[model samples]
Target: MNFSGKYQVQSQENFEPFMKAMGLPEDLIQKGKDIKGVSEIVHEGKKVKLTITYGSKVIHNEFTLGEECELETMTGEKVKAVVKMEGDNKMVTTFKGIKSVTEFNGDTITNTMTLGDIVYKRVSKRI
Candidate 1:
């Protein structure tokens, strides 16, 4: 909780060279970098909050979850995450929004979001 870390948008045209240098698929890198949507993330203890702003559209999406996990990171750091919400819902109406459970381990995170259909494993470190 209380995320005080840096996140990078991996979308850049010249990213392929870097990916090749790192021995990764250029296409995969590009796909990951492409912004799915404008989003915001916040953390508080075992609770996590996420908001996605759909382009030009009036509707906004929100998420909140609690079933989270705590971990010691690979770099000897500490982290935590919880299932919040993930889905497309207008900002004006609040229904049972999408929920995602996130577990943080330093730079690495296991996130279950969006109807429990998509899972993302992310790794990051303090700059």
Candidate 2:
């Protein structure tokens, strides 16, 4: 469960609906759907940092396990959230009305995002 590595987006499900539910602009949503993001994870003990890049957007986040921190969304909105480890390989967090569960299994990481009745899934593979 050493979640430290680089990952490339393999596939995404419900990308448009999820973005629309989040109130993203149409142009941005269209661009977002075509983006194959790259995510880098750096974790040690209780500290973790994540850097995700896609197109011209790059999100860098750092937080400690089980502690609340501010996270910025793709639309530049910031929200409070706490990330906790579920078992040894999964990280879970909820922010704004969205719940995100990310699980790591060997060379793959799957993120399941839920908001109200909407659910979006993104799968990434180690690169």
Candidate 3:
């Protein structure tokens, strides 16, 4: 199935500690920890567009599978990244020493990120 719909965060684990591990500002993490975000994905063959909305913030990124591109991260910085597909259902990438994997199973999407010893997992469902 294509990841083309908007998904709302249903639950999360290690959000606070993970953001803290990333050196995110204390105030920023505190404000975001309680807000559920929406992820909207548009995919066409090998190309994909992703929009992440958290309150008033909207981070935009688009990339083609197997190709390198500049992408905006959750920190709102444009970083050089490459998105790869695994088994047609998962997209994985690593940037700034963080590994991010987003997988879709039916109506649920699981996004997990790894940094140092901290692992952050957030589950979302189609809306």
The clash numbers for all candidates, in the given order, read: 12, 0, 0
Instruction: Report the C-alpha lDDT of model 3 over 47-127, residue by residue, as the tens digit.
Output: 777888767898877888787878775666676778886645578887777787988889689989886678888888889
What are the per-residue Cα lDDT tens digits for candidate 1 across 46-95?
33444333234322222334344442221122234433333221111111
**How would you order the candidates by lDDT, starting with the best?**
3, 2, 1
- 1 or 3, which is superior by TM-score? 3
Clashing pairs in 2: none
Candidate 3 to native Cα RMSD, angstroms: 2.1
Q: Which ten residues in a row have the lowest lDDT in candidate 1?
A: 86-95
Best by TM-score: 2
lDDT of 2 at 49: 75
- TM for candidate 2 is 0.85
Could you tell me the TM-score of candidate 3?
Answer: 0.83
TM-score against truth, every candidate = 0.29, 0.85, 0.83
Model 2 error, position 70 (Å): 1.8
lDDT of 1: 0.34
